[PDB]
Structure formats: structure tokens, C-alpha cells
Amino acid sequence: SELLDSFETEFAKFYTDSNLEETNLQKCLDHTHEFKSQLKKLKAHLNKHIQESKKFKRKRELIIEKLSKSQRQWDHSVKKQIKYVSQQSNRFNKSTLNKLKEFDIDSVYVNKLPKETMENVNEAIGYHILRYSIDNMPLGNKNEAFQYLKDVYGITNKESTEFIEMGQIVHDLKKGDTESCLKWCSNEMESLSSNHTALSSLKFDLYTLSAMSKVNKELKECTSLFIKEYCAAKHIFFDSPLFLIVLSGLISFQFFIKYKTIRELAHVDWTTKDELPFDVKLPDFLTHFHPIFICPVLKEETTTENPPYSLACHHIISKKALDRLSKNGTITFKCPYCPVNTSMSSTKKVRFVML
Amino acid sequence: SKRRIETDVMKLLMSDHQVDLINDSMQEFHVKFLGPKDTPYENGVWRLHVELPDNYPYKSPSIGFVNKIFHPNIDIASGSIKLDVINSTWSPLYDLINIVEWMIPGLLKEPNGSDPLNNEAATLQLRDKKLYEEKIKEYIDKYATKEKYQQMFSEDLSDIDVSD
Amino acid sequence: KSIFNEPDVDFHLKLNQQLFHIPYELLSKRIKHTQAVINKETKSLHEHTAALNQIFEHNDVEHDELALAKITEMIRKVDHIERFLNTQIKSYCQILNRIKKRLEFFHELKDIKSQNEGTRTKLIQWYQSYTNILIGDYLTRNNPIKYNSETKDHWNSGVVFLKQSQLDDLIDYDVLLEANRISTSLLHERNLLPLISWINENKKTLTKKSSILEFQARLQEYIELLKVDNYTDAIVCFQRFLLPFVKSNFTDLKLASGLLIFFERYLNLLDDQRWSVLNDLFLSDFYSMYGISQNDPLLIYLSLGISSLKTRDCLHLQLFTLHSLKRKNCPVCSETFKPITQALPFAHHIQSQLFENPILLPNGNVYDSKKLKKLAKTLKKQNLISLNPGQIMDPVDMKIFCESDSIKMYPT
Amino acid sequence: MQIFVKTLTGKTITLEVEPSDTIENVKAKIQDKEGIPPDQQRLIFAGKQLEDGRTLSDYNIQKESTLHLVLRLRGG
Numbered sequence A: 001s002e003l004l005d006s007f008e009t010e011f012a013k014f015y016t017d018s019n020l021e022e023t024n025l026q027k028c029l030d031h032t033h034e035f036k037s038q039l040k041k042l043k044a045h046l047n048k049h050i051q052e053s054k055k056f057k058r059k060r061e062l063i064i065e066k067l068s069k070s071q072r073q074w075d076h077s078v079k080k081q082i083k084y085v086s087q088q089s090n091r092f093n094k095s096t097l098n099k100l101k102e103f104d105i106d107s108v109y110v111n112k113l114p115k116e117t118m119e120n121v122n123e124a125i126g127y128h129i130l131r132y133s134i135d136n137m138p139l140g141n142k143n144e145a146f147q148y149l150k151d152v153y154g155i156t157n158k159e160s161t162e163f164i165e166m167g168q169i170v171h172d173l174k175k176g177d178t179e180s181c182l183k184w185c186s187n188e189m190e191s192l193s194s195n196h197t198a199l200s201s202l203k204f205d206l207y208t209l210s211a212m213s214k215v216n217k218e219l220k221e222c223t224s225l226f227i228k229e230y231c232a233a234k235h236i237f238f239d240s241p242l243f244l245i246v247l248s249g250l251i252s253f254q255f256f257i258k259y260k261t262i263r264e265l266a267h268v269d270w271t272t273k274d275e276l277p278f279d280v281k282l283p284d285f286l287t288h289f290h291p292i293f294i295c296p297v298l299k300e301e302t303t304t305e306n307p308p309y310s311l312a313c314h315h316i317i318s319k320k321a322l323d324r325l326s327k328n329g330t331i332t333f334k335c336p337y338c339p340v341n342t343s344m345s346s347t348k349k350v351r352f353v354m355l
Numbered sequence B: 001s002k003r004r005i006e007t008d009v010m011k012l013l014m015s016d017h018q019v020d021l022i023n024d025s026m027q028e029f030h031v032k033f034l035g036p037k038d039t040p041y042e043n044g045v046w047r048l049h050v051e052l053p054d055n056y057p058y059k060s061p062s063i064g065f066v067n068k069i070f071h072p073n074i075d076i077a078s079g080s081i082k083l084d085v086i087n088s089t090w091s092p093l094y095d096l097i098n099i100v101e102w103m104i105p106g107l108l109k110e111p112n113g114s115d116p117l118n119n120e121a122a123t124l125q126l127r128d129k130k131l132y133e134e135k136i137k138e139y140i141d142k143y144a145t146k147e148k149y150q151q152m153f154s155e156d157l158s159d160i161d162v163s164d
Numbered sequence C: 001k002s003i004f005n006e007p008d009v010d011f012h013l014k015l016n017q018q019l020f021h022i023p024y025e026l027l028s029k030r031i032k033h034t035q036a037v038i039n040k041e042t043k044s045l046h047e048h049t050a051a052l053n054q055i056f057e058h059n060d061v062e063h064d065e066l067a068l069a070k071i072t073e074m075i076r077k078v079d080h081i082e083r084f085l086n087t088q089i090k091s092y093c094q095i096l097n098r099i100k101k102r103l104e105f106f107h108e109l110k111d112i113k114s115q116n117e118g119t120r121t122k123l124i125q126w127y128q129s130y131t132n133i134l135i136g137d138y139l140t141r142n143n144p145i146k147y148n149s150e151t152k153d154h155w156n157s158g159v160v161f162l163k164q165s166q167l168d169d170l171i172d173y174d175v176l177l178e179a180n181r182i183s184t185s186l187l188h189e190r191n192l193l194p195l196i197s198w199i200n201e202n203k204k205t206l207t208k209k210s211s212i213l214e215f216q217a218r219l220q221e222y223i224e225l226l227k228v229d230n231y232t233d234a235i236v237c238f239q240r241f242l243l244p245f246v247k248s249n250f251t252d253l254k255l256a257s258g259l260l261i262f263f264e265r266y267l268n269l270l271d272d273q274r275w276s277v278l279n280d281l282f283l284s285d286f287y288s289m290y291g292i293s294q295n296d297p298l299l300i301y302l303s304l305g306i307s308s309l310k311t312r313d314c315l316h317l318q319l320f321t322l323h324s325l326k327r328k329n330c331p332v333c334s335e336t337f338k339p340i341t342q343a344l345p346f347a348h349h350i351q352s353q354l355f356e357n358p359i360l361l362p363n364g365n366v367y368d369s370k371k372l373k374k375l376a377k378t379l380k381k382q383n384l385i386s387l388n389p390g391q392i393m394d395p396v397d398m399k400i401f402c403e404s405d406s407i408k409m410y411p412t
Numbered sequence D: 001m002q003i004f005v006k007t008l009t010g011k012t013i014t015l016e017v018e019p020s021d022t023i024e025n026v027k028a029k030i031q032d033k034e035g036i037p038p039d040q041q042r043l044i045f046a047g048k049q050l051e052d053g054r055t056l057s058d059y060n061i062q063k064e065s066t067l068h069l070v071l072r073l074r075g076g
């Protein structure tokens, strides 16, 4: 956006070129080097003159004058340059970094994590590191990577052998050999609980790659498909939960900051402690995990203690809402959405389940 | 049931609607409203006073206009809105954002002259439908525009070689 | 214009500003040090050239030789200052490069967000790098420091993770290491020596901001000098360091003077919680000095993310059927995150997230027609069970039904 | 072309329709997918109520629009 452009334009003043190679202090260095140069030159002249003296009065006067003329120039130029460096630094700070202090992230941190649950934050980090950044580790052969992980990163979680084998077979596949992947797929095909269509497609991809610019795309597709199939087969998370949680936290930041403003503007009270007041909108691949039903009349989630009930013509409302509308099963009523009367012939607790 | 009232007020707040509580009661307050574009009520700005009964979901809210608006089914001495959906065809399913954004423009775009609340407005609506627009613009001007809302509310020697 | 509702680049810049606040502090320190020392050296050269000019007054051969010796000394001094300036420039360029790399990173983000299936993957990779930065910063922040016998350079799990993941320039990992080293020295080693050196190095800034840390450090040293009876050293330390604080604080000094021979006024003074209270003071001052966030950012992100997707129903042949349910991949249901899930609040949903075309079965469950038919077809093909034609089977509560007993449902 | 309709509660519905299709057909489709009788059911596009006589081609559509489902209101 525009602020990033402001940073990028104000930062370039630190250097003295468009290529961003030379800083400002190089002027100080060159001035000092030049000063030493004429000091050396004037000393050699002094010696040529002394050895001769063993007309010259003016020849000595030039040396005397120059030897004090050079020092003043060096002093003047050097203090000027370091000042301009200091002034430029202060100007950059004031004109650039003072537009960021308005937002303090620490103000958002409410509902802090308990101090006794750091053994889980350090356990999810291990899973994420094992899942994603395992290929860069100098693990080498097996049965020593265990010691490497336990000593460097301190990773001692259950899902370790599977990830080590996965990394090894992926690295082997990266060299073009497809014996390991084919053998593993054929072995997995034997059981009566594996997704046969995905395994068959992966086998077809391996057969096409084995027959063979175009290879790189096929190699990447086969690698990604093997990753997905193996993660599904071994009952582990394809995407680490920590990544999804952080990605949700970003969006939650974006909406919270706004809610706090509407809080300072108009003073309102939210009396339900266990539920945060505002609302957050999440992408498609972060929502449909549990069946969520919001009652039309009460605008509240539906819980096992407040099961949903279906009316006469198959609308769905809460249980306490149906109790209130038809008081303890005494009178009848119509839907709050259509003119069809309803009685105690309403079906039992409807249960929503995601397939 | 305060949860429904709180959720509806929060939904009103999180949008661009300007809501002002009175003594922070959370059950009665005021909402800013802007006229719909197409209708002659285009540049008008108004303020609504709403009050939510304690039995809110099953009892209709009380909504009125504190400014002045000309309309057959709207009072002139006050702003007592009168339409069936709020009065007798209210189901415990509509919301405050819903009620405003649906049935305030809905009533603005469909006056009914069978049994009006403003008799002179009904007579004008039945007679002419061309000068009614200039009247409404007129009354809007004298009682509720942006301004009215703002008001009421040397020799260089030679060269000697040098040592490394 | 956000792809999956993500914030704009300016919000990302505002969100983690320590990355730009710490290198600036290092730069300011470098410039201040250079300016001070170079002014001192300039003054020395000025007095040197005054003395030399005085030497040239007498037009004698011996005085001329002395002048030549003086010029040789001047050349040596200028060579020394040249070497110092070279070192300072070398240090300057690295700190500039840090901000250069961070700016390039955020510019790459902006370029990604300014161009949808192909673009989404690039954003996902960028956010993978983002979470890697956060994880590395967290690991560097709180993880015991392991000393190196070779090259005697401190290192940690966060440092090696950053070095290996090629995110070296995006995190300082050294000012954080210094904070960790001093804090663990205070908490466990009880050394208290590194804190004194840090205070001595940064005395002017503490005095300008008037933080009560130097006095507290001296008081803790004096108390530690009385747990083991060294009365002469305690007295000399009192008279050398604790005296100049009479104007600022007097009751504490009087109490310290009273503590000279060993009353609930003394359990606090000799308790062990004072080691932490000196750690908290030091950490608050350090983070205020550099600009580091008072809390671990990863913790804030987790706190928001867990409560943002916690639902009400979120904690309450056979193998394939059990794996067929789509509720067994909730990121917050996993055994790792369960206690945090219980601690954090629920979520506020204003719309019902459900599936497309529900149908209700006689038992009392509502399913999706197309998904249920696909599951029946899959079960029939792989021979997990024998079924009559035109029949469906429900996963939970093992049972079979026909298509004539499914009633349409209308969620709202 | 597929079009979206937003209801009072908030639920968004996607549905298939042709430019030659009548508005009565759209109301019948919404009846099938919601269960609300078409007589007490109105649509709103660009702030204008739609009549049964006119078809979908009378009002311009960009093949991906956002209609609004509305109930019946009357003064008195």
C-alpha cells in the first residue's frame, strides 16, 4: 500500500546511490584516507628539504602552511559528514517510524493462555517443525535423527517415525526413483479401508512419471499427491493445526481492533462472558468443521442441552423456543416464517452431522 | 431475555448505522437514517427513537420519528409509524437491522390510502402524483436536511614518491 | 480486494513494528558512539597540530627533526582512526541490510497481493514463512541458552532454527539472546554481574527516564553481601554506591542501614521473590528501551485463533465409517490443544454454517443427499457391506433405510 | 448463469436460472428450496420490486447477481 511506499522512499536516503551499495559514512572514510595521504606527502617533502639543507625559506613556508591547512579541512569535512548522518537518521525516524506507534498489539491480548499449558504450545511447535521443515535438517540416516531432534530441538512426540520415513521417501522420490512409492502404494492397496480412487490415480501418476520442462510439473504434482495420500492414510494432519490457528488469529486481529472503537464511541455492555461479542468472517477452508445451527428466533447456537426441533412443516427452531411459543405443550401456533400451524406432533431432537 | 437485545444492538452498531443510547439504557435509543436513493425521499436525513420492551422477541418494538416527515401512514404531530408487520404481523424472527433496512424503505415506497393516518397527505396522494414529489421535497427541506440535522442534533611544490 | 479476508499490507507493517524498531535502536547507538569517539580524536589531533606549529617556530635542524617525528606520530594516529572508522562502517552496513531484507519481504507480500487459484498458493506459502518467523521468535524468546565450547558463542534452539530456515535477517535473535542470558543469570545463577555491566553501559538512558533499577541492583548486591557475613565489604559497598541516593529515596536507604546485623518488615527484604522483582524491572526496562513487544506474539495469535473457531459442539467397515465423518479434523479438537480450548471462550456466529440439501431419516439424523448417496456407492463398490438396491446407510448408529423414508428439511 | 438470493435471516442461496425464465419460475424454485409459499414472497433487485408478468430478461443481469428475498408489508 501507500505506507510501504513511504518506507521504501524514505529508507533509500540512507544510501548514496540507486543500487543501494554505498552508505553515508564512506565520505568520512575517504576524507580520512585523503588526509593521511597528504600527511605522507608533506612528510616526504620535509625530508627532501632537510637532506638538501645539510629560495628554501619559501619552500619551507609552503610546507608549514599546508600542514595546518590540511588538518582544518579534514576536521571541517568530517564533523559536517557525521552531523549530516545524524540529522538524516533522526529525520528518517521522526518522519517514518512515528506513524506506527498508534497501534500497540499488546492491547489486544486478553483472555491470556494459562501458564500451565506451555507444555502444549511447545508440543504443537514440534509437530509443525516435523511436518514442514524436516528436509532442511542434516538428519542423514535414521536412528541418529532421533538424537538430533531430542538434543537440538527437543522434539519427543509420538508422530516422529512416520514423518522421518515420509521425509526419506520424499527425498528418494526427488531423485526420480519410484520403487519406494510404488511399493508403498501397492502395500496400502491390500486393506479394505483405503481410498481406492485416490491410490489408483496416484499409481497412474507414478506410471506416467516412470515412463518419462514437463517432468518438473509432473514431479511436483506426484510429490504433492503422495504427501496428501500418506497423510490421509496414517491418520495425521495434512496441515498443522498451529498454522490454521495463526491464520485465524490474523483475521481476528482485523475485526477486534474495529470492535474496540465502537466500544469507545458508544458505551455498551456484553453480559455473556464465555462468548466473545463481535463476529469474525473466515475463509471457506476454515469454517465447515462442525455443524453449526443458529436459531432464527433466539439467534443463539444450538447445544446438546438446547436441541433443535422440527415443526409441523419441517422448519427447525430451538427447544426452549418451541416451549415458549407453545407453552409446555398446551396451545398451538404457526411458524415464525410461514402460515402453517404446529402442534405437539413436532418430531424429536433433530441431529445435524457433517458427512 | 437480554441476549437477543444485545445481539441486535451489536449488529446495528457493527454496520455504518449511527446508534446513540439514552442514559446507556440498551433498550431505548436513537438510530440515524438516510433516505433511499430512488424515491423523492433521496437527500433527507432523519432520526428514529426506538424502544425495545423487556419481552422483546415476542413483543413488537416501539419505533417513532423525532423529526418531521410527510407521509399518509406516518403522523405529522409525531413520528408514530403504523404498519401491520410491526403491529399485527410481527413474527419473532425479524431484527433491528432487518426492520430498518427492510420495512422503512418498504413503507417509504408503498403508501396506502385506504385508511391513512395523515388525511391531507391521503387527499394529496389520491389527487395528484406529480406535485406530491415537490411537496415532499419542500417539507423535507423545511424540517429535515443535512443542515437541519447538524443544527438540531600556492606552488603545490612537486610530487615526491611515497612508502607503502 | 483481499483474497481470503486478509488484512492489507499497512496493517501487516503496523502489526509487527519491533522488526523495524530494534535495528533503528542499534543504528542510533552506532552513530552516537562514532560521533563521540571521533570528536575526541579530532580534539587530540588539534592539540597535536598546535604543538607541531609551535615546534616549527624555531628554524633549527634539531627542531625540524622533532617536527618530522611529530608528523610520523600524526600519521600513526590517523591510521588508527582510519581502522576504527572502517570497523564502524562494517558494523553499519549489516544493520542497514537487516531493514533492507525486511522491507523486501513485505514488498514481496504486496506484489503477491496485487495480482485466483494460482495466486492463493503463493499467499499460503508467504503465510507459512510468516508463521515460521513467529515460531522462531517465540523459541528464541524463552528457551535455555546452551553455551558453546568451540568459539565460545552462545546459541539456542531458536537461533539454529532461524539459521537453518534461511530467515536469518528477519529476526535479530541476539538482543533477544542477551535478554535471555541476563534474565536466566538473575533467576538461576544469581550472578547479578551481567546486570551491573548492562546498567553501567546504559546508565545515561536510565537516568534520563528515571527508572529505579540502578538503586535496586545496588540494594540487591548489598543484601546478598549480608547473607554471607562480609561486614567490611558490605560497609564499603554501602558507602560507595548506596549513599548518592539520599535525595531520591530515603526510607529504603534507612531500612538498608538498619539491615546491618542480620519484624515483618524484613521477610520481604530478604525474601527470594526480590530476584524476580529485579528480573521484571530489568525486562520491562529492556523492552521499553528496544521496542520489543511485552508479550510473545505467537501467544496473542493463538489466543485469538482458538476462540475464533471454537464452537458449542466442539469437545463432546467400522473403521472406514468412523473415518468418514468430517468433524474429525478440527484444528482445536486435537489432543494437543484441548486444555487451551477449555480455557478460552467460545465463538460468536451470526449465521448457521451448514450443508446444501438436508434430508431427515426416521432415527432422527439429518444428512446430505448427494454425499450420502456417494457414501453408499463407495461402500457398495469396495464390498464393505451387502446392500439391497435403492437403499442408503447411515454412518453413525449402524442402520439401513430406503429413499422413500427421507423427509426434506428447511433450515433457516 | 447462477444467481444468489439473500433472505431476511441472512442465509444465501445459489440457484440456476435462464434469462428466458419467468419470475414465477424463480419463486417456485425458492419455494422448493425454502418451503415458503410463492404468494407471500417478493424479490428486490436494485431497490425495486419485481412483478410476475415481466420475465428475467426485462431486468438486466450480469450472470452473477444478488437478489433479495422479502415478505409482504402493508400499511393501515
Ligand SMILES: [Zn+2]
Pocket (backbone or CB within 6 Å): A311, A313, A314, A315, A335, A337, A338, A340
Ligand atoms: Zn413452517
Ligand SMILES: [Zn+2]
Pocket (backbone or CB within 6 Å): A289, A290, C311, C313, C314, C315, C330, C331, C332, C333
Ligand atoms: Zn472442533
